[PDB]
Amino acid sequence: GLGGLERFCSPGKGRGLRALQPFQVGDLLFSCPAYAYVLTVNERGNHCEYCFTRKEGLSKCGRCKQAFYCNVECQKEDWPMHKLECSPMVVFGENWNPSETVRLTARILAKQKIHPERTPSEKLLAVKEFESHLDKLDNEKKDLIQSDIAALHHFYSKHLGFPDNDSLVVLFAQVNCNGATIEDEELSHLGSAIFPDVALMNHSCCPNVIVTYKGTLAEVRAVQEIKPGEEVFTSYIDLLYPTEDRNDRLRDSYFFTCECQECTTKDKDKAKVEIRKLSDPPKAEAIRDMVRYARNVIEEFRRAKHYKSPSELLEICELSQEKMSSVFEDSNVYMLHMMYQAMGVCLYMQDWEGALQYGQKIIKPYSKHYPLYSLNVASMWLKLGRLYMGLEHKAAGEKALKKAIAIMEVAHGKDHPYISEIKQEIES
Template sequence: MECEGIAGIEQFSSPGKGRGLRVSRAYEAGELLFSCPAYSYILSVNERGFICEQCFTRKKGLAKCGKCKKAFYCNVNCQKKNWPMHKLECHAMCVYGENWCPSETVRLVARIIARLVRYKKHFITLFVETESMNMEDMDNEKRELNEAHIAGLHHFYSKHLDFPDHQALLTLLSQVHCNGFTVEDEELSSLGLAIFPDIALLNHSCCPNVIVTYRGINAEVRAVQKISPGQEIYTSYIDLLYPTEDRIERLRDIYYFSCDCKECTTKSMDMEKMKVRKLSDEISQKEIRDMVCYARNAMEDFRRLLEMCELSIDKMNTVFDDANIYILHMMYQAMGICLFMENYDGAVRYGEKVMKPYTVLYPAYSLNIASMYLKMGRLYMALDRKSTGISALQKALAIMEVVHGKDHTYVTELKQEIRGE
């Protein structure tokens, strides 16, 4: 059956995966398959004052809400359109002040419930045929988190919303958990959370043939390789940098399934991703496993501490090659810490070590690679290395024209940046 309202795309039963989408005509790399508006969405609190709450346009001179003075809009039209959702929070923010602190998940679920009530629909209709996690599969930590979300809903929104029963809320939270999207900008910084029911129909593959990007509150699906008629459309739910074992573990933990794509079956990139040093004494498998455990723990424990990152890199360097993904991850974190500390020379040093392996380990049209070229280009420009900076920005542009489309605001603004406008 043709996917409702989307020409050239049809919904079908994907073997072993449930529902899925496939194309009924050919698409070339860079071509837009379809776009869809968010059903419901929230702007991250950290982005308030920089981005319009209604349309997610980033601009200067936004007008603030006259009541709470915490929500910002392009103009009166955007404010009026957003009021049915903003009113859930406006009064509460005034009352609670600094104590107003619902999680982003709670804020999104509240808006979903409000919209369904407004249009007199039962919440389950939003996720028809979409997957949710099995409640029995959740560990205690996830159960406790869901209970905390429900408590947050009642605490911050009970004056404005009538909630379904407890089990229905648990089901809705699990569906949002599995089908929610983090809306990101061109540098992959999080802007907020959203629900896109049509995008949620896409199945996962570690060899994706499409990529999802954002234009305001619309999600766009573009081909990153040639897709023939009848082929299923696959996106990736997770970061593809990591080796098969890590990817499968993450998919099981978040989405409760394993991937059987070509890359997960052949593990063709694992050796490249898990490079070890060539030493006179061969490194044993036990040493590699021990170092993997160390690297995983280090990534969690020392993510924001530059000194610990550097110590971890030194330690891992005794076994791992510089292009090993655990070394790359730690250097990427170190780069971020340097940026936060305004140590731009240090950020460039780590970024240059990360950049080349990224272009080997990620697919050619990767948002991660484009983001790194953007960061590096802007760093070079800030350090008066103009020609090197423009070269990096042009490489980012070449990828962004495919994954975002040549008419996207991000692409237009980057072209102006390159021209020095």
């Protein structure tokens, strides 16, 4: 398996990963090549399909004209997977729209068909041993999975010999509980992948490691000191939100309730739900009313941004901030949430000054709500630094970039290509 590590049975968590030797903050616990992976549609042309390297002047697949490569070698290496989509993409035309989960599952089945034996990605845990939580799925969940299976048959029937329906349901549930989004240095979505050895790690809201990505390779580095015998815990979710929100998401997606220190004590929750200390104290029921409102408007915005204009979205953020502010301080995570969304739609609108203005009032609370080494914090420092540099505020830009580097050296490793790029952006 992996030196200095050991698969074991973690009480109340099923199987987990334990350390057999000490690891210091920044040490590399291990690296894991992707078992199967797929680049998200919106990043085609920016990244190489095979190795995920970002560069300009990628070779275009002459066949489908929708898959870009470093060279003919990367193209050849990606052909066993790319042929699943090359011709269907041109035949279906505009009707080709499988969800990313379907694309990934199709590549999983292909990888099992050609490489049925244990891969180097499965040193400690094989794909077939994945947890499915089949018995927990309600009818709504089952019907969503059945819709994905229907799409799988619809777009990938010519190249894959499919197992029976039951097995496909198990596979999709396993993907939903073990899949891994790949994000860039600004936590922008690059694609989805299966990292069997990485999936073994259980969740904690105070994790001791962070998973970063070097192309299609997952790397796992410590963000706290790990001693022999201690279990290795990563985070599955955004840690910004209070305990009940986190466990709502964990129950919904992974079907378990977390009992880590943050969940048991809920101490940071008080900072996260900051109430204005005004002459008139809000009553508890008014607080809970505004909290419910906040959680509702967050979901409403997730929906609205698919069919609404950017300015309409900014209006939603501005109006919700005013209403919520009557009760919530600006450091409240629901205010920060709407500020972050406003920053994103301003970034899309290319209003760099506006987005910078929002980002400035986001990093101060962000830094304290998130753990010491957090990719969310690093990415915010990086976005800020790049806006500063773009608007020629070099002094403040360099400051922000160094803060990002300080966290990334730990999480990504000091020799990571991203850090080289950022140091170039300081010297240029």
